[PDB]
Coordinates of C-alpha atoms (C1' of nucleotides) in Angstrom, one line a residue:
Chain A
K1 CA -7.3 28.9 7.4
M2 CA -6.3 28.1 11.1
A3 CA -4.5 29.7 14.2
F4 CA -2.3 28.5 16.3
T5 CA 0.5 28.6 18.8
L6 CA 4.0 27.6 18.3
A7 CA 4.8 27.3 21.3
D8 CA 8.4 27.1 23.4
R9 CA 7.7 26.2 26.5
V10 CA 5.0 24.4 27.6
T11 CA 2.1 24.9 30.3
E12 CA -1.4 24.1 32.1
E13 CA -3.4 24.6 28.8
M14 CA -1.5 22.4 26.9
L15 CA -2.3 20.2 30.1
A16 CA -6.6 19.6 29.3
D17 CA -7.7 15.6 29.9
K18 CA -8.9 15.9 26.6
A19 CA -7.2 16.2 23.7
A20 CA -6.5 15.7 20.0
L21 CA -1.6 14.8 20.1
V22 CA 0.4 14.8 17.2
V23 CA 4.2 13.2 17.7
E24 CA 5.6 13.4 14.2
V25 CA 7.8 10.4 13.1
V26 CA 9.1 11.0 9.6
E27 CA 11.7 7.8 9.3
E28 CA 8.6 4.8 8.2
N29 CA 10.8 2.1 10.6
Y30 CA 9.9 4.8 13.8
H31 CA 12.7 2.4 15.9
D32 CA 14.6 4.8 17.0
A33 CA 13.6 7.0 15.1
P34 CA 13.7 11.2 15.2
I35 CA 10.6 13.7 16.5
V36 CA 10.4 16.4 14.7
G37 CA 7.0 18.1 16.0
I38 CA 4.4 17.9 18.6
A39 CA 0.8 19.4 17.9
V40 CA -1.9 19.1 20.4
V41 CA -5.2 20.1 19.5
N42 CA -7.9 20.6 22.7
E43 CA -10.4 22.7 24.4
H44 CA -8.4 25.5 25.1
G45 CA -6.9 25.9 21.3
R46 CA -3.9 24.2 18.9
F47 CA -0.9 24.4 20.0
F48 CA 2.8 23.4 18.3
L49 CA 6.2 22.1 20.4
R50 CA 9.5 21.6 19.6
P51 CA 10.2 18.2 21.0
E52 CA 12.9 18.7 22.5
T53 CA 11.0 21.2 25.1
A54 CA 8.5 19.5 25.5
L55 CA 9.9 16.0 26.1
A56 CA 12.2 17.3 28.8
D57 CA 9.5 19.5 30.7
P58 CA 8.9 17.0 33.2
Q59 CA 4.7 17.9 33.4
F60 CA 4.2 17.1 29.5
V61 CA 5.7 14.2 30.1
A62 CA 3.5 13.5 33.1
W63 CA 0.3 14.5 31.1
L64 CA 1.6 12.0 28.5
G65 CA 1.6 8.9 30.8
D66 CA -1.4 10.0 32.5
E67 CA -4.1 7.4 31.7
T68 CA -6.7 9.5 32.7
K69 CA -5.5 12.2 30.0
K70 CA -7.6 11.1 26.7
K71 CA -5.7 11.7 23.4
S72 CA -6.7 10.6 20.3
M73 CA -4.1 10.2 17.2
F74 CA -3.4 8.2 14.4
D75 CA -1.1 5.6 14.4
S76 CA -0.3 5.2 17.8
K77 CA 2.3 3.0 18.3
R78 CA 4.3 4.5 16.0
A79 CA 4.1 8.4 18.6
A80 CA 4.3 4.9 21.5
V81 CA 7.4 3.7 19.5
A82 CA 9.2 6.1 19.0
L83 CA 8.8 7.7 22.4
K84 CA 10.2 3.8 24.1
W85 CA 13.3 4.3 22.4
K86 CA 14.2 7.9 24.0
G87 CA 12.3 6.4 27.6
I88 CA 9.1 7.5 27.8
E89 CA 5.6 6.1 28.1
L90 CA 3.0 7.3 26.3
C91 CA -0.3 6.5 27.9
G92 CA -4.0 7.4 27.9
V93 CA -4.9 6.9 23.6
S94 CA -8.9 6.5 24.3
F95 CA -9.6 6.8 19.6
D96 CA -7.2 6.4 17.2
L97 CA -7.8 7.4 13.5
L98 CA -5.8 4.9 11.6
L99 CA -7.7 2.0 13.0
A100 CA -11.0 3.8 13.1
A101 CA -10.7 4.0 9.8
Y102 CA -8.8 0.6 8.5
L103 CA -12.1 -1.1 10.0
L104 CA -14.6 1.4 8.0
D105 CA -12.6 0.1 4.9
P106 CA -8.9 -1.4 5.0
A107 CA -9.5 -1.8 0.9
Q108 CA -8.7 1.8 0.2
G109 CA -5.2 1.9 2.4
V110 CA -5.8 5.1 4.3
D111 CA -2.0 5.5 6.1
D112 CA -2.6 9.1 6.4
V113 CA -4.9 11.4 7.3
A114 CA -5.7 13.2 4.8
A115 CA -6.7 9.9 3.5
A116 CA -8.9 9.8 6.6
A117 CA -10.2 12.7 6.5
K118 CA -10.8 12.3 2.5
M119 CA -13.8 9.8 3.9
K120 CA -15.2 12.4 5.7
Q121 CA -14.5 14.7 2.6
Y122 CA -12.4 17.0 5.0
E123 CA -10.1 18.6 3.0
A124 CA -7.9 20.9 5.4
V125 CA -5.0 19.1 5.7
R126 CA -2.5 17.8 3.4
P127 CA -0.8 14.5 2.5
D128 CA 2.2 13.3 4.4
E129 CA 3.6 12.5 0.5
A130 CA 2.6 16.4 -0.1
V131 CA 4.4 18.0 3.0
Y132 CA 8.0 15.7 3.0
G133 CA 8.1 14.8 -0.8
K134 CA 8.7 11.0 -2.2
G135 CA 12.2 9.6 -2.0
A136 CA 15.2 11.0 -2.1
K137 CA 13.7 14.6 -2.6
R138 CA 12.0 13.2 1.3
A139 CA 12.4 16.2 3.7
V140 CA 11.3 17.7 6.6
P141 CA 10.2 21.8 5.6
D142 CA 10.9 24.6 7.7
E143 CA 9.5 24.8 11.1
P144 CA 6.5 26.8 10.2
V145 CA 5.0 24.8 7.4
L146 CA 5.9 21.7 9.5
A147 CA 4.1 23.1 11.8
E148 CA 1.1 24.0 10.4
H149 CA 0.9 20.4 8.6
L150 CA 0.9 19.0 12.0
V151 CA -1.3 21.5 13.9
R152 CA -3.8 20.8 10.5
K153 CA -3.1 17.4 11.3
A154 CA -4.4 17.6 15.5
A155 CA -7.1 19.9 14.3
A156 CA -8.5 16.6 11.7
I157 CA -8.0 14.6 13.7
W158 CA -10.2 16.2 17.1
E159 CA -12.9 16.7 14.7
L160 CA -12.9 13.7 12.9
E161 CA -13.0 11.7 16.4
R162 CA -17.4 11.9 16.8
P163 CA -18.3 10.8 12.7
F164 CA -16.0 7.5 12.9
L165 CA -17.1 6.3 16.0
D166 CA -20.7 7.5 14.9
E167 CA -20.6 5.3 11.6
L168 CA -17.9 2.4 12.9
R169 CA -21.1 1.9 16.3
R170 CA -23.4 1.1 12.9
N171 CA -21.3 -1.4 11.5
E172 CA -21.5 -3.3 14.4
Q173 CA -17.6 -2.1 15.2
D174 CA -17.5 0.5 17.3
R175 CA -16.2 -2.5 20.5
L176 CA -13.8 -4.2 17.3
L177 CA -12.2 -0.3 18.7
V178 CA -11.9 0.1 21.2
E179 CA -11.8 -3.6 22.9
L180 CA -9.7 -5.2 20.3
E181 CA -8.0 -3.2 18.4
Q182 CA -6.5 0.1 20.0
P183 CA -5.5 -2.4 23.3
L184 CA -4.1 -4.9 20.5
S185 CA -2.1 -1.2 19.6
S186 CA -0.9 -1.6 22.9
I187 CA 0.8 -4.6 23.6
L188 CA 2.1 -4.4 19.6
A189 CA 3.9 -1.7 20.8
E190 CA 5.4 -3.7 23.1
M191 CA 6.4 -6.6 21.5
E192 CA 8.4 -4.4 18.8
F193 CA 10.2 -2.5 21.6
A194 CA 11.2 -5.5 23.5
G195 CA 12.7 -7.2 20.3
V196 CA 14.2 -10.6 19.8
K197 CA 17.4 -11.4 20.2
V198 CA 19.7 -13.4 17.4
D199 CA 22.5 -15.7 17.7
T200 CA 24.4 -13.4 15.2
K201 CA 27.5 -16.0 15.2
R202 CA 25.6 -17.9 14.5
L203 CA 23.9 -17.0 11.7
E204 CA 26.7 -15.9 10.6
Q205 CA 28.8 -19.7 10.3
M206 CA 24.8 -20.3 8.7
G207 CA 25.9 -17.5 6.2
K208 CA 29.4 -18.9 5.4
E209 CA 28.9 -22.5 4.8
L210 CA 25.3 -21.7 3.0
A211 CA 28.4 -19.7 0.2
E212 CA 29.7 -23.2 -0.3
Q213 CA 26.7 -24.9 -1.3
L214 CA 25.4 -22.5 -3.0
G215 CA 28.9 -22.7 -5.5
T216 CA 28.5 -26.2 -5.3
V217 CA 24.8 -26.8 -6.8
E218 CA 26.0 -23.4 -8.9
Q219 CA 28.3 -25.6 -10.9
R220 CA 26.9 -28.8 -11.0
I221 CA 23.4 -26.9 -12.4
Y222 CA 26.2 -24.9 -15.0
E223 CA 27.3 -28.9 -15.6
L224 CA 24.3 -30.4 -16.3
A225 CA 23.0 -26.9 -18.2
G226 CA 26.3 -27.3 -20.7
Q227 CA 26.8 -23.9 -19.8
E228 CA 26.6 -20.9 -17.4
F229 CA 24.0 -18.5 -16.9
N230 CA 22.0 -16.5 -14.6
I231 CA 20.4 -19.2 -12.5
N232 CA 18.5 -15.9 -10.5
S233 CA 16.6 -14.7 -13.8
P234 CA 13.5 -16.3 -14.8
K235 CA 13.9 -15.4 -18.8
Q236 CA 18.5 -16.8 -18.7
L237 CA 16.8 -20.3 -17.4
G238 CA 13.7 -20.3 -19.6
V239 CA 16.1 -20.2 -22.9
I240 CA 18.1 -22.9 -20.7
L241 CA 15.5 -25.4 -20.2
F242 CA 12.2 -23.9 -22.5
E243 CA 15.7 -23.6 -25.4
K244 CA 18.1 -25.3 -24.9
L245 CA 16.7 -28.6 -23.1
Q246 CA 14.1 -28.3 -25.4
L247 CA 11.8 -29.0 -22.3
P248 CA 8.1 -29.1 -22.5
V249 CA 6.2 -25.5 -22.4
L250 CA 3.5 -26.3 -19.2
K251 CA 2.5 -22.7 -18.1
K252 CA 3.7 -19.0 -19.9
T253 CA 3.3 -16.0 -17.9
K254 CA 2.2 -11.8 -19.9
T255 CA 5.9 -12.3 -19.0
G256 CA 7.1 -15.2 -20.8
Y257 CA 7.3 -19.0 -20.3
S258 CA 7.2 -20.9 -16.2
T259 CA 9.5 -21.1 -14.0
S260 CA 8.2 -21.6 -11.2
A261 CA 8.1 -24.9 -8.7
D262 CA 5.5 -26.1 -9.7
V263 CA 6.2 -26.3 -12.9
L264 CA 9.9 -27.7 -12.2
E265 CA 8.9 -30.3 -10.3
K266 CA 6.7 -31.8 -12.9
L267 CA 9.9 -31.4 -15.4
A268 CA 11.5 -33.7 -13.1
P269 CA 11.0 -36.7 -15.0
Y270 CA 12.6 -35.1 -18.3
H271 CA 16.1 -33.7 -16.7
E272 CA 17.7 -33.9 -13.4
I273 CA 18.6 -30.2 -13.3
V274 CA 15.4 -29.1 -12.3
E275 CA 15.7 -30.3 -9.2
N276 CA 18.8 -29.2 -8.9
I277 CA 17.3 -25.7 -9.5
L278 CA 14.7 -25.5 -7.7
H279 CA 17.5 -26.9 -4.6
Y280 CA 19.6 -23.5 -5.5
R281 CA 17.7 -21.4 -5.6
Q282 CA 15.7 -23.0 -1.7
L283 CA 19.2 -22.2 -1.1
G284 CA 19.6 -18.8 -2.4
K285 CA 16.7 -17.7 -0.7
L286 CA 18.4 -19.0 2.9
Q287 CA 21.4 -16.4 2.6
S288 CA 20.1 -13.3 0.4
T289 CA 17.1 -13.4 3.2
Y290 CA 17.7 -14.5 5.9
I291 CA 21.2 -14.6 6.2
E292 CA 22.3 -11.0 4.8
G293 CA 18.5 -9.5 5.5
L294 CA 18.9 -10.1 8.6
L295 CA 22.1 -9.6 9.8
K296 CA 20.8 -6.0 7.5
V297 CA 18.6 -4.9 10.2
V298 CA 19.8 -6.7 14.1
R299 CA 21.0 -3.4 16.4
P300 CA 24.9 -4.3 16.1
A301 CA 25.0 -3.4 20.9
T302 CA 22.4 -5.3 21.5
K303 CA 22.1 -8.0 19.0
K304 CA 18.0 -7.3 18.3
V305 CA 16.2 -7.3 15.8
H306 CA 12.6 -5.3 15.5
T307 CA 9.5 -6.3 13.5
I308 CA 7.3 -3.7 12.7
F309 CA 3.7 -5.1 13.1
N310 CA 1.8 -3.6 10.5
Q311 CA -2.4 -3.4 12.2
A312 CA -3.6 -1.5 9.3
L313 CA -2.8 -3.7 6.1
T314 CA -4.5 -6.3 5.7
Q315 CA -7.6 -7.0 3.5
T316 CA -8.9 -10.1 6.4
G317 CA -7.4 -8.2 9.5
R318 CA -4.4 -10.3 10.1
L319 CA -1.2 -8.6 10.6
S320 CA 1.3 -7.8 9.2
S321 CA 5.6 -7.9 10.1
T322 CA 7.9 -6.1 8.1
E323 CA 11.7 -4.8 8.0
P324 CA 12.2 -7.9 9.2
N325 CA 9.2 -9.8 8.5
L326 CA 8.9 -12.4 10.8
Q327 CA 6.2 -13.7 10.5
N328 CA 7.3 -16.2 7.1
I329 CA 11.2 -17.3 9.4
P330 CA 11.8 -20.4 7.2
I331 CA 10.4 -24.1 9.1
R332 CA 8.9 -27.1 6.7
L333 CA 12.0 -28.1 5.3
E334 CA 14.7 -28.7 7.9
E335 CA 18.1 -26.6 6.3
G336 CA 15.9 -23.3 6.3
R337 CA 14.2 -24.6 9.6
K338 CA 17.6 -23.9 10.5
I339 CA 17.5 -20.5 10.7
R340 CA 15.5 -20.9 13.4
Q341 CA 18.1 -21.6 15.7
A342 CA 19.3 -17.9 15.4
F343 CA 16.2 -16.2 17.6
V344 CA 17.3 -17.3 21.4
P345 CA 15.8 -16.1 24.5
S346 CA 16.8 -11.9 25.4
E347 CA 18.4 -13.8 29.2
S348 CA 19.8 -16.4 30.3
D349 CA 18.1 -19.0 31.6
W350 CA 14.7 -17.7 29.7
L351 CA 13.6 -20.0 27.0
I352 CA 11.2 -19.8 24.5
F353 CA 7.7 -20.8 24.0
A354 CA 5.8 -21.4 20.6
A355 CA 1.4 -21.9 21.0
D356 CA -0.5 -22.8 17.5
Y357 CA -4.1 -22.8 17.7
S358 CA -4.3 -27.1 15.9
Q359 CA -6.4 -26.3 12.3
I360 CA -8.0 -23.5 13.3
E361 CA -9.3 -22.4 9.6
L362 CA -10.8 -25.3 9.3
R363 CA -13.2 -25.2 12.4
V364 CA -13.9 -21.5 11.4
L365 CA -15.3 -23.2 8.9
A366 CA -16.7 -25.9 10.8
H367 CA -18.6 -23.2 13.2
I368 CA -19.8 -21.0 10.2
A369 CA -21.1 -23.5 7.9
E370 CA -23.2 -25.1 11.1
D371 CA -22.0 -28.6 9.0
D372 CA -23.4 -31.6 11.3
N373 CA -20.5 -33.8 10.1
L374 CA -18.0 -31.5 10.4
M375 CA -18.5 -29.9 14.1
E376 CA -19.1 -33.9 14.9
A377 CA -14.9 -35.1 14.0
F378 CA -14.5 -31.5 15.5
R379 CA -16.7 -32.4 18.8
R380 CA -15.2 -35.5 18.3
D381 CA -11.9 -34.8 18.4
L382 CA -11.5 -37.2 15.1
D383 CA -8.8 -36.3 12.7
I384 CA -10.4 -34.3 10.2
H385 CA -7.5 -34.9 7.8
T386 CA -7.7 -39.1 7.7
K387 CA -11.8 -38.1 7.8
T388 CA -12.0 -36.2 4.0
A389 CA -9.6 -39.4 2.9
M390 CA -12.7 -41.7 3.9
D391 CA -15.4 -39.7 2.4
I392 CA -13.6 -38.5 -1.0
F393 CA -11.6 -42.0 -1.3
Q394 CA -14.8 -43.5 -0.3
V395 CA -12.8 -46.5 2.1
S396 CA -12.6 -47.6 5.8
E397 CA -10.0 -45.7 8.3
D398 CA -7.6 -48.3 8.2
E399 CA -7.4 -48.6 4.3
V400 CA -6.3 -44.6 4.4
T401 CA -2.5 -45.1 3.4
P402 CA -0.9 -41.6 3.8
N403 CA -0.3 -40.4 0.1
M404 CA -4.7 -40.7 0.6
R405 CA -4.3 -38.5 4.6
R406 CA -1.9 -35.6 2.1
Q407 CA -4.1 -35.3 -1.0
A408 CA -7.4 -35.3 1.6
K409 CA -5.3 -32.1 3.8
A410 CA -5.0 -30.1 0.4
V411 CA -8.4 -31.1 -0.3
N412 CA -9.5 -29.4 3.5
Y413 CA -7.8 -26.2 2.6
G414 CA -8.1 -26.0 -0.8
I415 CA -12.2 -26.3 0.0
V416 CA -11.3 -22.6 1.9
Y417 CA -9.9 -21.5 -0.6
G418 CA -11.8 -21.6 -2.8
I419 CA -9.7 -24.3 -5.0
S420 CA -11.2 -25.4 -8.0
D421 CA -10.6 -29.8 -9.9
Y422 CA -7.5 -27.5 -12.1
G423 CA -6.4 -26.3 -8.9
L424 CA -6.1 -29.5 -7.1
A425 CA -5.6 -31.5 -9.7
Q426 CA -2.5 -28.9 -10.5
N427 CA -1.6 -29.1 -6.6
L428 CA -1.9 -31.9 -6.6
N429 CA -0.1 -33.4 -9.6
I430 CA -3.3 -35.8 -10.2
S431 CA -5.6 -36.7 -13.0
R432 CA -8.1 -33.2 -14.2
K433 CA -11.1 -36.4 -13.9
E434 CA -10.6 -37.4 -10.2
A435 CA -9.6 -34.6 -8.3
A436 CA -13.6 -32.9 -9.3
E437 CA -14.5 -35.8 -7.8
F438 CA -12.6 -35.4 -4.5
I439 CA -14.6 -31.7 -4.3
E440 CA -17.3 -33.3 -5.4
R441 CA -17.6 -36.1 -2.4
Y442 CA -16.5 -33.2 -0.4
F443 CA -19.6 -31.5 -1.1
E444 CA -22.0 -34.4 -0.5
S445 CA -20.5 -35.5 2.2
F446 CA -20.0 -31.5 4.4
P447 CA -23.0 -30.0 3.1
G448 CA -23.4 -27.3 5.4
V449 CA -19.8 -26.1 4.3
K450 CA -22.2 -26.3 0.2
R451 CA -24.8 -24.8 1.6
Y452 CA -22.2 -22.1 3.0
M453 CA -20.4 -21.0 0.3
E454 CA -23.3 -20.5 -1.8
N455 CA -24.7 -18.8 0.5
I456 CA -21.6 -16.7 1.4
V457 CA -21.7 -15.9 -1.9
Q458 CA -25.1 -14.6 -2.1
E459 CA -25.2 -12.1 0.9
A460 CA -21.7 -10.3 -0.9
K461 CA -24.2 -9.7 -4.0
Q462 CA -27.0 -8.9 -1.4
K463 CA -24.8 -6.5 1.7
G464 CA -22.2 -5.5 -0.8
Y465 CA -19.3 -7.1 1.8
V466 CA -18.9 -9.9 4.4
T467 CA -18.5 -10.8 8.0
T468 CA -16.3 -12.5 10.3
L469 CA -16.6 -13.9 14.3
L470 CA -16.1 -9.8 15.9
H471 CA -17.9 -7.6 12.5
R472 CA -14.6 -7.3 10.8
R473 CA -16.1 -6.2 6.9
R474 CA -14.8 -6.6 3.7
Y475 CA -16.0 -4.8 1.0
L476 CA -16.1 -6.7 -2.1
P477 CA -18.1 -4.2 -5.1
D478 CA -17.0 -6.9 -8.2
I479 CA -18.6 -9.6 -6.5
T480 CA -21.6 -9.1 -10.0
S481 CA -19.2 -7.7 -12.2
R482 CA -19.9 -10.1 -15.6
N483 CA -16.7 -10.9 -15.5
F484 CA -16.8 -14.2 -15.1
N485 CA -12.9 -13.6 -13.9
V486 CA -13.7 -11.2 -11.9
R487 CA -16.6 -12.1 -10.4
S488 CA -14.5 -16.1 -9.5
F489 CA -12.0 -14.0 -7.6
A490 CA -14.9 -11.6 -5.5
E491 CA -16.7 -14.5 -4.5
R492 CA -13.2 -16.8 -3.3
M493 CA -12.9 -13.3 -1.1
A494 CA -16.3 -14.1 0.1
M495 CA -15.4 -17.3 0.6
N496 CA -12.0 -17.0 2.6
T497 CA -12.6 -14.2 3.8
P498 CA -14.7 -14.8 6.8
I499 CA -12.2 -18.3 7.1
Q500 CA -9.4 -16.4 7.7
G501 CA -10.7 -12.7 9.3
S502 CA -12.4 -15.0 12.2
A503 CA -9.4 -16.5 13.1
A504 CA -7.6 -13.5 12.9
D505 CA -10.1 -12.0 15.6
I506 CA -9.6 -14.6 17.8
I507 CA -5.4 -15.1 18.5
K508 CA -6.3 -10.8 18.2
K509 CA -8.5 -11.6 21.1
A510 CA -6.5 -14.2 23.0
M511 CA -3.2 -11.5 22.7
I512 CA -5.4 -9.7 24.7
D513 CA -6.4 -12.0 27.0
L514 CA -3.2 -13.1 27.9
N515 CA -1.7 -10.1 28.2
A516 CA -4.0 -9.6 31.8
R517 CA -2.9 -12.8 32.6
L518 CA 0.2 -12.4 32.6
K519 CA 0.2 -9.1 34.2
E520 CA -2.2 -10.4 36.9
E521 CA 0.4 -12.9 37.8
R522 CA 2.8 -11.6 38.0
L523 CA 4.9 -13.0 36.1
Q524 CA 8.2 -12.1 33.9
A525 CA 6.8 -13.2 30.6
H526 CA 6.1 -12.0 27.3
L527 CA 4.8 -12.0 23.5
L528 CA 7.8 -11.3 21.5
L529 CA 5.8 -12.3 18.0
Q530 CA 2.6 -13.5 17.1
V531 CA 3.0 -15.7 13.6
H532 CA -1.1 -15.6 12.3
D533 CA -1.9 -18.4 14.5
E534 CA 0.3 -18.9 17.0
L535 CA 2.1 -17.2 19.7
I536 CA 5.4 -16.6 20.4
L537 CA 6.5 -15.5 24.2
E538 CA 10.0 -15.8 26.1
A539 CA 10.0 -16.3 30.0
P540 CA 12.6 -17.8 32.3
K541 CA 12.7 -21.6 33.0
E542 CA 11.2 -21.5 35.7
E543 CA 8.0 -20.9 34.5
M544 CA 7.7 -23.3 31.5
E545 CA 5.1 -25.6 33.7
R546 CA 2.7 -22.2 34.0
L547 CA 3.4 -21.5 30.9
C548 CA 2.1 -24.8 29.9
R549 CA -1.7 -24.0 31.4
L550 CA -2.2 -20.8 30.8
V551 CA -1.0 -20.4 27.3
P552 CA -3.1 -22.6 26.1
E553 CA -6.0 -22.0 28.0
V554 CA -6.6 -18.8 27.3
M555 CA -6.2 -19.1 23.3
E556 CA -8.3 -22.2 24.2
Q557 CA -10.6 -20.3 25.8
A558 CA -10.7 -16.9 24.5
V559 CA -14.0 -17.1 21.7
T560 CA -17.0 -20.3 22.3
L561 CA -17.7 -21.5 18.8
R562 CA -19.6 -24.4 18.1
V563 CA -16.8 -26.7 18.3
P564 CA -14.2 -26.9 20.5
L565 CA -10.6 -24.3 19.6
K566 CA -7.1 -26.4 19.8
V567 CA -4.3 -25.8 21.0
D568 CA -0.4 -27.3 20.9
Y569 CA 2.7 -25.6 22.2
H570 CA 6.7 -26.4 23.2
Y571 CA 9.3 -24.5 24.8
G572 CA 13.1 -24.6 24.2
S573 CA 16.4 -22.9 23.9
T574 CA 15.6 -21.3 21.0
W575 CA 13.4 -21.3 18.7
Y576 CA 13.6 -24.1 16.8
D577 CA 14.2 -26.1 19.5
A578 CA 10.2 -24.9 20.8
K579 CA 8.7 -27.8 18.4
Chain B
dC1 C1' 10.0 0.2 -10.8
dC2 C1' 6.8 -4.1 -12.0
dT3 C1' 7.5 -10.0 -12.0
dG4 C1' 8.3 -13.3 -10.5
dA5 C1' 9.8 -16.4 -7.6
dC6 C1' 10.4 -18.5 -2.1
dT7 C1' 9.3 -17.2 2.4
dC8 C1' 5.0 -18.1 6.1
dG9 C1' -0.1 -19.0 8.4
Chain C
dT1 C1' -8.6 -22.1 -12.9
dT2 C1' -6.7 -22.0 -3.9
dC3 C1' -6.0 -17.4 -0.1
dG4 C1' -3.7 -13.5 2.8
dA5 C1' 1.3 -11.6 3.4
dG6 C1' 7.3 -9.6 2.8
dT7 C1' 11.8 -9.7 0.1
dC8 C1' 14.6 -10.6 -2.6
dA9 C1' 17.8 -10.2 -7.5
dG10 C1' 16.6 -9.4 -11.8
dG11 C1' 15.2 -6.3 -16.0

DNA sequence: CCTGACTCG
DNA sequence: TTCGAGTCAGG
């Protein structure tokens, strides 16, 4: 039972200086999406307002934009961005229930108020999916029903604020919420709304040339196979490779023969077709995802793409990026890398500026493990891959070949991801006996790291969770499973999450610090993207000199570790050229 | 819808 | 039998 006022005009008591606020955007992608209703709960009552009314009411808009009028919300970024597309500013958000729930336990996958309410046994609100339905049945219900849902969500936020803040504090996560994630949410809202401009003429031309090349590679594959088939079908491909051409079966999955890139690479001594097939699938992914998929989400009038950074999704503390994902744009092979030529500045005589942390996960490892030998390598800035090579190959620096260094690189990151000798041998296509020795030698060379890996798994067993530098947590209830596979997965998460998660913490704080500096110096430069360990900005060309100093300094100084942090940077006329 | 394959950190 | 994401085509 819950009384509320279904209001048809705004009143003074609706504008109190503390309220739970709901600004409901039901489309998953909130860019330029309709606002279907509004609810306010405060000391004076519970109210529902129509958007057309309240959003045209100068007093309500003033209240929204007034920083001293504090609002508690769930997913404030969604409301903030949807409001931006209507030219309205939302300020004063002092508590975000989505982010609070996310910090308390990312595993719960909270993405509606009812799901957060569940964490505190609060049942006086329905799941969104219950009210709106799913798939083709999805629809906004009749006003009375909508109104009650929005009011119940606001009522829930109102009552849940203190219980959530109280638990965050005993978890040592209250500052993580209010000083890191909540400020970052506003910064991400700005980035999403600004968007990134795309050179569609260039993308469309690339797509036309790619179609041509696909056709050619395709026919060559059929010629080598002696038959036509669907190359994009791992099932049909498997019949061609392992039945028709009788190539060895190196791996099976639950569904059948594996045709993974790793397997096809290993088959190259048997038949040249596998190299053609790998190329074809590369080209096809470029076409389908980064040409076609990208062109579908460009807003035709402004030629911008507006990603959504999911801030409350990953288990480690990272962001993700969707519709489109701008955190997986090709870079490692030159053919794919050219896609980046189509990401351009939003203004004339602006440039793209890209700054990345060098080896942040390995530096975080050095810090947390307190390994003398690894800390000293970074403190002296020795090449960490060449150093590991000297140890795992047992040679002097002058004897380290480029291939040995590449193998050591694989050992250095593999350790951070819990690699076994099997995985390392498969990765490097080397002897498993050898791979096991690489690992044995690594741990003899970096005994602090070995101790850290043992200790963190013990900590996980004892506490039930692991923590990052800035007190993010991930629970690991499988860490004591009797099942080898299940327990092993949890142990590798114990090892890896504090590293990936602490690196996430660091770059998040850098974004907040950087944004502060940019505004302080009245620079026009602004953030466009974050890609886990790098930040991409655009700015008028005049500001490059300043950014060359400002951006890396702010990023290097974000946190102080037991080793230095290092940032590299580049700028140019497109994302491609900022290299 | 899931699986597996390509993409990034 | 190396971690964490999103999108795509095929089935």
